[PDB]
């Protein structure tokens, strides 16, 4: 009586095409706030003058 199920399943078969195959996504949400930045890259820390 017109109350659809909000969820729906994906079909990931090995015979799927390039537009249907699964793609594992990892969105690295970077942010630049005024707080001390704890996440950094592997840059060699130098001395201080």
């Amino acid at each position: 009586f017109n109350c659809y199920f909000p969820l729906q399943s994906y079909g990931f078969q090995p015979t799927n095409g390039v537009g249907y195959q699964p793609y594992r996504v990892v969105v690295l949400s970077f942010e630049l706030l005024h707080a001390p930045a704890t996440v950094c890259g592997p840059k060699k820390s130098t001395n201080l003058v």
Partner: antibody, heavy 117, light 112 residues
Framework: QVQLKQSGPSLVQPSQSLSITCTVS????????VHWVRQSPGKGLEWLGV???????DYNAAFMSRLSITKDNSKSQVFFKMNSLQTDDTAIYYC???????????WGQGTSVTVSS | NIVLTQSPASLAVSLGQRATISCRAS??????????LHWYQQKPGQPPKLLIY???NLESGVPARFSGSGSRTDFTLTIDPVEADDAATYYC?????????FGSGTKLEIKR
């Protein structure tokens, strides 16, 4: 992996009843509501009914008083009881899995039920 | 009651062209938040399959050549390009009001 084929009827006369046995596989009966339709008897595709997940069931306006759905959750089989059939109702009857927006995602092979004296 | 007077009754579209299968409806609004419907396919030598759900989305197992959109009553199923997997009858189904009837059925013929 998925099987929704029908069987059970051989031949039926007009204005009589019958019983269909649709073997469900690939998904649990408590997870999706098995739909029930025909295969184009003359005019476009005809919809009959659907048994929801452990609740009530909807039927067609022209087949609510005659056709009924009997869903067996223990045997993983959905039985169908039809009454007062006409020769024009001859078509292949299908079972299908419920989708997200009440869609029919999977479809079976069905069985060609023939009505004739 | 919804009378899905789907038109045309049949098509003759050659390979590589665009086939248009319209579907006329009468009711209703707010299927999920809009006035879309589902599309299906019934092949003569293979069981049927679901092509498009909500008339705007792709389904696994079938190619992405099937697309389209639709208004409250003026719906459209676009098959572009036409390949050798389209010779079958196409239907449209509304599910926002009982009975969940289908369209009249457009028998697409591959015009080779």
């Amino acid at each position: 992996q998925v099987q929704l084929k029908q069987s059970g009827p051989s031949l039926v006369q007009p204005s009589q009843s019958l019983s269909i046995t649709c073997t469900v596989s690939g998904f649990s009966l408590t997870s999706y509501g098995v739909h029930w339709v025909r295969q184009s008897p003359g005019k476009g595709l005809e919809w009959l009914g659907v048994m929801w997940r452990g609740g009530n069931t909807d039927y067609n306006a022209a087949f609510m008083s005659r056709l009924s759905i009997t869903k067996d959750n223990s045997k993983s089989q959905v039985f169908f009881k039809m009454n007062s059939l006409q020769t024009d109702d001859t078509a292949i009857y299908y079972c299908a899995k419920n989708g997200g927006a009440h869609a029919m995602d999977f479809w079976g092979q069905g069985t060609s039920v023939t009505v004739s004296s | 009651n919804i009378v899905l007077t789907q038109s045309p009754a049949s098509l003759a579209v050659s390979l590589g062209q665009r086939a248009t299968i319209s579907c006329r409806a009468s009711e209703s609004v707010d299927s999920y938040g809009n006035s879309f419907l589902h599309w299906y396919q019934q092949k003569p030598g293979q069981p049927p399959k679901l092509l498009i759900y909500l008339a705007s989305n792709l389904e696994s197992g079938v190619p992405a050549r099937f697309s389209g959109s639709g208004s409250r009553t003026d719906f459209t199923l676009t098959i572009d390009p036409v390949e050798a997997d389209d010779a079958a009858t196409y239907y449209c189904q509304q599910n926002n009001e009982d009975p969940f009837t289908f369209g009249s059925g457009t028998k697409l013929e591959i015009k080779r």
